[PDB]
């Protein structure tokens, strides 16, 4: 009977539940159940198994093309949101954005002090910055990081990765870093734990997770330099048992009145542009936001068009680097 909503756990899930899910469900007088997952392939596994239990799944803008093509996503209702309220391309026929985030470089202050890695070239520099690296066990932001470490300008990341030559060089660069990678982190909360325990010297992970660990007492610092500007959002699983109830829930939770509370404790940036006027965030709060003008200036946006074409190559090639 409950609409089942799934995200990636930890601080990020707690922020969505507190700001969006609990108030939207209360306003619609509906009951919902939470679940946790780390990859859209788990939703693909449900659809292919012939037994769908999830209604709404929280995925990334670059997972959307792959998931839609594999028949994992329901087509959303046309005016579920007003597209003018969200950044361009962040709302498709099968995806509604809820936030922007950064896949960025964090470093251990006990290891490097203020003299930590401030670029991808620095992150990949085991000679100037010796120590334990941690990278995601999934490729989005990881392949691009290698491309940046090779000296590719931020605005040319996907131009360099369009060639089979650049795609191979990126994997070779990750292969060269691989002996220095002590942990291939799987979840945002695990990444936050590695940071809190100082188990790693540097890490490429999500800004909200990093800020959360620092808030919790981690002696780490970070930068938006060379970070990938990502977009998180929601999709309804093809064959969702509570499809029309999930459509109603998704429409409600996308509203500015809920979106405004999304960064209250967790360092994320709401996607509904109308939320900023309602919350009137302080410049200090804005500085932690991935989509803040000064932060965007040193980042590059993830390109779903690249992932729509090269994900399978990336998934297999990156698995080998880790193995």
Ligand X SMILES: NC(=O)CC[C@H](NC[C@H](O)[C@@H](O)[C@H](O)[C@H](O)CO)C(=O)O
List of residues contacting ligand X (CB under 6 A): 7-8, 12, 37-40, 58-60, 63, 99, 101, 188, 206, 208-209, 232, 268
CB-based burial label for 102 (10 Å; 0-12, 13-18, 19+): buried
Nearer to ligand X, 189 or 202 (CB): 189
Question: What does the per-residue mask of binding to Ca ion show for 283-312, with x meaning CB under 5 A?
Answer: ------------------xx----------
Binding of residue 221 to Ca ion (CB under 5 A):
yes
Residue closer to ligand X (CB basis): 37 or 158? 37
Least separation, in Å, of the C-beta of 34 and ligand X? 13
Tokens encoding 214? 């620092």
Q: Shortest Cβ distance from residue 17 to Ca ion (Å)? A: 13
Q: In whole angstroms, how close is the CB of 102 to Ca ion at the nearest point?
A: 10
CB of 64 to Ca ion, least distance (A): 11
User: CB under 8 Å to 69, separation ≥6 — which residues?
Assistant: 308
Taking the C-alpha atoms of residue 56 and residue 30, their distance in angstroms, rounded to an integer, is 14
**Residue 117 touches which of ligand X, Ca ion, none (Cβ within 5-8 Å per kind):** none
- Tokens standing for residue 195: 């940071």
Given the complex with Ca ion, which of 85 and 257 has the nearer CB atom? 85
Q: Residues near 11 by Cβ (< 8 Å), separated by ≥ 6?
A: 188, 189, 192, 208, 209, 212, 266
107 binding Ca ion? (CB under 5 A): no
Rg (CA), the chain: 19
| Cβ proximity to ligand X, 226 vs 232, nearer residue | 232
Question: Distances in Å between the alpha carbon of 15 and those of 233, 266, 283, 286?
Answer: 14, 6, 21, 17
Burial of 31 from C-beta contacts in 10 A (0-12 / 13-18 / 19+): exposed
135 binds, among Ca ion, ligand X, none (CB under 5 to 8 A by kind): none
Pairing mode, if any, of strands 181-185 and 133-136? parallel
> With respect to ligand X, which residue has the nearer C-beta, 148 or 213?
213
Q: Is residue 10 part of the contact set for Ca ion (CB under 5 A)?
A: yes
Strands 3-7 and 96-108: unpaired
Residue 201 binds what, of Ca ion, ligand X, none (CB under 5 to 8 Å, by partner type)?
A: none
186 touches 322 (CB < 8 A): no
Asked whether position 158 contacts Ca ion by CB under 5 A, the answer is no
Least spacing, CB of residue 134 vs ligand X, in Å: 14
Given 192, 194, 245, 314, the residue binding Ca ion (CB under 5 A): 192
Q: Which two tokens stand for residue 102?
A: 């950064």
CB 173 within 8 A of CB 122: no
289 binds, among Ca ion, ligand X, none (CB under 5 to 8 A by kind): none
Least Å distance, CB 175 to ligand X, is 24
CA distance 191 to 184: 9
Select from Ca ion, ligand X, none the partner in contact with residue 90, using the beta carbon and a kind-dependent cut-off of 5 to 8 Å.
none
3 vs 290, which CB is nearer to Ca ion? 290
Kindly tell me which of 105 and 240 has the beta carbon lying closer to Ca ion: 105
Nearest-5° Cα angle at 74, 69 to 80: 120
Of 11 and 263, nearer to Ca ion (C-beta) is 11
Identify the CA nearest to 144 among candidates 124, 125, 128, 115. Answer: 124
Binding-site partner at residue 231 among ligand X, Ca ion, none, CB < 5 to 8 Å by type:
Ca ion
Residue 177 tokens, joined: 């870093």
Query: What is the binding site for Ca ion (CB under 5 A)?
Result: 10-11, 189, 192, 209, 212, 219, 221-222, 229, 231, 301-302
């Amino acid at each position: 009977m409950d609409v089942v909503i799934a995200s990636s756990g930890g601080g990020w899930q707690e922020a969505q539940d507190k700001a969006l899910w609990a108030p939207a469900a209360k306003a619609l007088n509906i009951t919902y159940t939470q679940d946790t997952f780390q990859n859209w392939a788990e939703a693909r596994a449900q659809v292919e198994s012939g037994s769908v239990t999830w209604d709404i799944i929280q995925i990334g803008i670059a997972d959307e093309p792959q998931a839609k093509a594999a028949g994992v996503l329901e087509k959303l209702d046309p005016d579920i949101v007003n597209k003018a309220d969200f950044p361009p391309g962040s709302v498709t026929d099968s995806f509604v954005a809820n936030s922007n985030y950064s896949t960025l470089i964090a470093w251990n202050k006990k290891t490097y002090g203020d003299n930590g890695p401030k670029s991808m070239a620095d992150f990949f520099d085991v000679k100037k910055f010796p120590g334990k690296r941690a990278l995601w066990n999934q490729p989005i932001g990881m392949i691009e990081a290698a491309a940046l470490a090779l000296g590719t300008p931020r605005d040319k990341v996907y131009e360099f990765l369009s060639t089979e030559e650049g795609r191979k060089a990126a994997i070779a660069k990750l292969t060269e870093l691989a002996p220095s990678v002590s942990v291939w982190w799987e979840s945002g909360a695990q990444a936050a734990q590695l940071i809190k325990d100082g188990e790693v010297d540097m890490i490429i992970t999500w800004g909200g997770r990093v800020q959360g660990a620092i808030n919790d007492g981690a002696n780490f610092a970070y930068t938006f330099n060379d970070a990938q500007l990502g977009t998180d959002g929601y999709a309804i699983v093809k064959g969702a048992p509570h499809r029309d109830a999930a459509m109603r829930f998704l429409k409600e939770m996308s509203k500015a009145e809920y979106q405004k509370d999304l960064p209250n404790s967790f360092a994320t940036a709401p996607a509904n542009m109308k939320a900023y006027d309602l919350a009137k965030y302080t410049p200090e709060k804005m500085a932690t936001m991935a989509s803040a003008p000064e932060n965007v200036a040193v980042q590059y946006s993830v390109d779903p068009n690249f992932w729509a074409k090269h994900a399978k190559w990336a998934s297999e090639a990156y698995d080998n680097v880790r193995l």
